[PDB]
Each structure stands twice: as structure tokens, then as C-alpha cells.
A paper describes a structure:
The main protease (Mpro), also called 3CLpro (3C-like protease), represents an attractive antiviral drug target. Mpro is able to cleave pp1a and pp1ab at 11 sites, catalyzing the formation of a series of non-structural proteins critical for virus replication and transcription. In fact, a variety of studies previously demonstrated that only the dimeric form of Mpro exhibits enzymatic activity. Here, we showed that a peptidomimetic compound with benzothiazolyl ketone as warhead, YH-53, is an effective inhibitor of SARS-CoV-2, SARS-CoV, and MERS-CoV Mpros.
We also solved the crystal structures of YH-53 in complex with SARS-CoV and MERS-CoV Mpros at 2.04 Å and 1.99 Å resolutions, respectively. The SARS-CoV Mpro-YH-53 complex is crystallized in space group P1, while the MERS-CoV Mpro-YH-53 complex is crystallized in space group P212121. Compared overall, the SARS-CoV Mpro-YH-53 and MERS-CoV Mpro-YH-53 structures show high similarity with the SARS-CoV-2 Mpro-YH-53 structure, with the RMSD of equivalent Cɑ atoms being 1.040 Å and 1.322 Å, respectively. Particularly, YH-53 forms a C-S covalent bond with the catalytic cysteine residue of Mpros of SARS-CoV and MERS-CoV, and forms several hydrogen-bonding interactions with some conserved residues, as is the case with SARS-CoV-2 Mpro. The main differences for YH-53 interacting with Mpros of SARS-CoV-2, SARS-CoV, and MERS-CoV were observed at the P1′ and P3 subsites. In the case of the MERS-CoV Mpro-YH-53 structure, the benzothiazole ring of YH-53 flips over and moves outward from the active site when compared with SARS-CoV-2 Mpro-YH-53 and SARS-CoV Mpro-YH-53. This binding feature also helps to build a hydrogen-bonding interaction between the benzothiazole group and Ser144, but deprives the hydrogen-bonding interactions between YH-53 and residues Thr190 and Gln189. Furthermore, it is the nitrogen atom of the benzothiazole that interacts with His41, but not the sulfur atom, which forms a hydrogen bond. In addition, the main chain carbonyl group at the P2 subsite forms a hydrogen-bond interaction with a water molecule. YH-53 inhibits MERS-CoV Mpro with an IC50 value of 3.103 µM.
Residue numbers in the entry:
A (entry chain A): 3 to 301
B (entry chain B): 1 to 301
Amino acid sequence: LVKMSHPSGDVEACMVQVTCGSMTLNGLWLDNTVWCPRHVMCPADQLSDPNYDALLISMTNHSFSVQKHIGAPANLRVVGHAMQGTLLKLTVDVANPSTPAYTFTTVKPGAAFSVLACYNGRPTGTFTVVMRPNYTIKGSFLCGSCGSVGYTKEGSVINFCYMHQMELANGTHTGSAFDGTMYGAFMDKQVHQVQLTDKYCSVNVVAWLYAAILNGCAWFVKPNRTSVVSFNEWALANQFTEFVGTQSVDMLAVKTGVAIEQLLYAIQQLYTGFQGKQILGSTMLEDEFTPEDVNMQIM
Amino acid sequence: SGLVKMSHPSGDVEACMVQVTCGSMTLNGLWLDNTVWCPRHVMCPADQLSDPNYDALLISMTNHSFSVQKHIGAPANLRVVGHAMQGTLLKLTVDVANPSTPAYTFTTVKPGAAFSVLACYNGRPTGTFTVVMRPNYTIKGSFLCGSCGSVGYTKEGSVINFCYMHQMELANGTHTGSAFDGTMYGAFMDKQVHQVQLTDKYCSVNVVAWLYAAILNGCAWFVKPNRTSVVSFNEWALANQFTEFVGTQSVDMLAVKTGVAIEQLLYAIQQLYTGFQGKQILGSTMLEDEFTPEDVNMQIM
Ligand SMILES: COc1cccc2[nH]c(C(=O)N[C@@H](CC(C)C)C(=O)N[C@@H](C[C@@H]3CCNC3=O)C(=O)c3nc4ccccc4s3)cc12
Ligand SMILES: COc1cccc2[nH]c(C(=O)N[C@@H](CC(C)C)C(=O)N[C@@H](C[C@@H]3CCNC3=O)C(=O)c3nc4ccccc4s3)cc12
């Protein structure tokens, strides 16, 4: 089991640098559109309390500059601007000839996606995270990473789901979907913001227990069962997300012969502590791997 | 913690992966300029995998024995016009130079150092991850049948350093391969026989970096005034499944920034190994050695 992200090449060919005044960050160029965080527009004196409508009104196409540094580098001309939630939709005069097939999806808590971290329009690293139940991610981002992009891929279509915007007071990160809505209803302004209390992603804990059984670690499997409905009611009071079955979990159920309901019962017992024992070398429940991960990695 | 498993963006290496077939055997290869590198056991008949005679096998080959195809991006009219064997790898010469060859070197990676892996099947990139070379010359990767010829690399400036070509999964979950000079890591053999790795060890210098990352995040309950010298720690390490600590400039920057000395963390390690005393560090109840000093310097700064 490793943290496995998609190959980033197709997304690399879409990264650009966006400049507005003396401010810069990353943007994503698809077709004739460049997407980027709207706080490019924001003077340093207005970061803590910005008026984005007033700021956008004071912009012309000419306020915005877009540079591509990767591939055959190019200057693009901004021929239109618009604001969509927390994102800027610039229109440019050239279409990206390396535009992949893509959609815009919103990731759900517990689901994994790949992030391409960039600075000044240059990809520097790639990693994968799961969206946390409190709609933050446990990333690795520094000043200037804003506009870095998160995505999944089904076959050859890339599903863009995340554009990075902020690091909260705790170690964690958040950003917006490409409809422009910030995950977790956080605000793109320079203010201290307190996230909700996080939860265990139940379906990923289940996936992880199936991975243990697949590896010969099954000491926690008992005949006792907890129904999904019973589990989900118990989950409300215990900081666990609602469990929603999928095809991937069922395949692990069929492969191991252990029913989902036996592991939901197991989670309720192990949540109190492992009483001296370990599971896959761990003393705590692991929710950072998905059923798809376990399926694919241990095919 | 602000620490993730950070790989280099794979686009450079994706544009170099190809599929190499010899008879009815297939795996991945690496296309750079007029050369395609792939594991030599693509030459071996399944009946003979357990005991190959790669010298005899190579004599038996002609240029026409090998077929190379690039499926991704712009595809492949690739004709093999030369072949050769270098250690456990084949070096094939092809008549088209890869137009997307990155600046590259071949360097052997050392235990404790991290590198990016591009996992591929039948010439198609499917995933990327990063690993640290274990002190017993294995990596804890995620590889299935057909991943052979997948590549591990690091990147310095514009220069890709290719350090690993995938070859085997040992009887534990664990993986090994060769450097591009042709030598298998750990002197394993590329043949279909059971092989036992040497015992693995904690990478002391990476554990030190991780504790520094803890201090940088305000997690410093484990820091005491007590110290253990490098010499005394390294003598302790031979007795306790830890690698020799070798300090570097990257570790020094961490020590200066935090104001906690390496030797304080060497003492902390000796205590934390015996037990975390019901506490955790960066969300872990056990020492973590899969993050390098360079990792912490880059990701936390
Ligand atoms: C009292 O203030 C705080 C209290 C407690 C926690 C806090 N967090 C933040 C906060 O996150 N600010 C956002 C900015 C806001 C406006 C979205 C921000 O700095 N994003 C970074 C990535 C950040 C930085 C650290 N690593 C993270 O990934 C980024 O790349 C860029 N920002 C700008 C801004 C202007 C121009 C170019 C760029 S580029 C402020 C804050
Ligand atoms: C009784 O012998 C054993 C006892 C105990 C543990 C063992 N492990 C291995 C062993 O690993 N063999 C090598 C192959 C050898 C010869 C280096 C191998 O299967 N490589 C795989 C990747 C492996 C497979 C599972 N996931 C891993 O990454 C691969 O991709 C390909 N192999 C071939 C082989 C021939 C033609 C095309 C391809 S393509 C043998 C063995």
C-alpha cells in the first residue's frame, strides 16, 4: 500500500502563471480559459477584508497577464475577465492545444485525488490526498502554491476537482471546486478561520481492514455484525462519517469472504483502542486509503 | 504535519516509456535518444526463468527479436538496429531518437535517499509514488505483474537522474531492481528463484529530519536537554537496527533554525524507540524514517 497519484503530464501542459499588478500565482489553461484564484486581484492592504465586487469592477482585461513557462513557452493575451465564486475566469486569445478531455467534479469526503503543486506557473511536485470530512486536506503547500490543481482521471478524461487557496491555522489546506465554491465554506481572505472537528472516513477504515485481511491480519474479525443503518446512527455520535457501500467495497467483501457488517462491528470495538495489538503495523485506524486503492494496489 | 509523499511531476519520464516485447514476453522500457533500456529477463523463456543463461540467450537474439512501441502521446515507428547486454539490463539501439528526451544522468541511489517511481504496465504510465531506498536495498513500492521496467528517478535542475529500473517483488511485500549501469541493488539476481533480503534498519538521519519537522510544527514534548554524541549513537545503532548517522548540511539547517542540536535528537531517538510513553508525534506512535532532511527542508522550509 503506497500513496499513488496519477501521472501528472497531461495536467503539467496546462499550468500557467497569472499576474495582476504586483501579485502572482498559478492558473489552469483549458481551451480559451484561464482559471485562477480571485485573490490575485487583491491589494496587500485589502487582503484581510476584501471587496471582490469592487475589485473586479476596477479591473480591465489589461490588469491581467498570463505566462506559460512549461512546454513551448508563450505569452497569451487576456481578452475577457469574469468572476465565478472564488475563482477568476479569464478568457485568452489562444486555445490550449494540449487541452485534455476534462470535466469539473466536486470531490466528496473520503475520496482521493492527485494534486500538482506549482509555483510561478512551474510544476514542482505531485502527491495524493483524500478530502477530509471537515473539507480540508492534509497537503504540502507554501506561499505561491495558490492555483495549484487537484484532479482525478477516469480512463483518459481528467476530472478537475480542486484549486488551492489557503492553509488554515492548523496544518491543513483548502481551496475551491471549479464552480468556484470553497470546500467547507471557508473564505478566501486573510483571516484566522477555525475548521470543524474532523471525522474518520468510515468507508476507508473498512477498506484498510480489508487490506489487512488480504495481508493475513484478521484477528479482529468476529461473527458479530453491525448493520449499515445501525453503524450510521452510531457514527453520528462518534465522529465517523456515514458509511455508503460501493462496488469496490463489495469486491473486497467477496474476495475475502468477510461481510461489510462484520467490519462495521469491528470498527466500533477497535475505536476504543486496540488493547495492545496492531493492525498492519498500526495502533490506530487508518482512513487515508480508499476501497479503489486496496482494489487496485492489491489486485 | 505539512509532510506528504512528494514525487516529481512525471511528465518528463512519461514521454520516454515504451513497451518492449521479445517473443511472447513483454514489459516496459525506457527510450532516451537512440537507446531503449529494459530488463534482460524479457529475453528468457518461461521454462527457463529459474535458471537463465543470459549469455546464451543474447547470442540467440537478432535485432529482429525485439519489438518496441510507444503508445502514449505521439506513437511509435520504432525499429531495433542494435542490441547489447549491460549487467541485468538490455541496451537496444533504435533508429529514431526520442524527440522528448529530458536532460538526464544515471546515478546509483543510496539507502535512506528518496526517489520518484513511475509505475507502468505494457508501456502505459499508470501511477506515481515515492519511496526511500531501504538499508537492505529494497523499496516498499506498489507493483504488480507487468510493472517490470518501471523507472525510479530524481530531478535536480532540469536534469533527470535515473536511478532504478524495476525487476522483482521479494517474498515479503518488498521490491528491488537495478541501476542503469546494470547492477541489481543488493546483489539480488534477476531470476525466478526465492531470495531472502538482509534485515532492514531505521534510517537514523531520516528519523532525525522527521523529529525536526515535529519541532517545526510545535511538537517538541520529546526534546530534553540530554544529548547523545554521534559516536555513541552510532555504536548504539549497530546494536539496535538503526543505520549509522551521517550528518549533512541539510540536517545542519534544521538544527540552526530550531535551535535543537542533532545530539539532543539522537538521545530522543534512543528513548522513543523503547516507547512513545502513550504520546504521539505528528500523529504517529512510532518513529518515521521515510522523510529525508531534504524533504523537510523543501516541504516545511
Ligand atoms: C490572518 O491570516 C491568517 C491566519 C491564519 C491562517 C491563514 N491562512 C491564510 C492564507 O491561507 N492566505 C492565503 C491567501 C488568502 C487571501 C486566500 C494564502 O496565502 N495562500 C497561499 C498558499 C498558503 C500560503 C501558506 N501555504 C499555504 O498553502 C498562496 O499561494 C498565495 N496567496 C496569495 C495572495 C495574494 C497574492 C498572491 C498569492 S499566492 C491567512 C491566514
Ligand atoms: C520462485 O521465485 C520467486 C520466489 C519468491 C519471490 C519471487 N519473486 C519473483 C519475481 O519477482 N520475479 C520477477 C521476474 C524475475 C525473473 C526477475 C517478476 O515477476 N517481475 C514482475 C514484477 C513482480 C511481479 C509481482 N509484482 C512484482 O513487482 C514483472 O513485472 C515481470 N516479470 C516478467 C518475467 C518474465 C517476462 C516478463 C515479465 S514482466 C520471483 C520469485
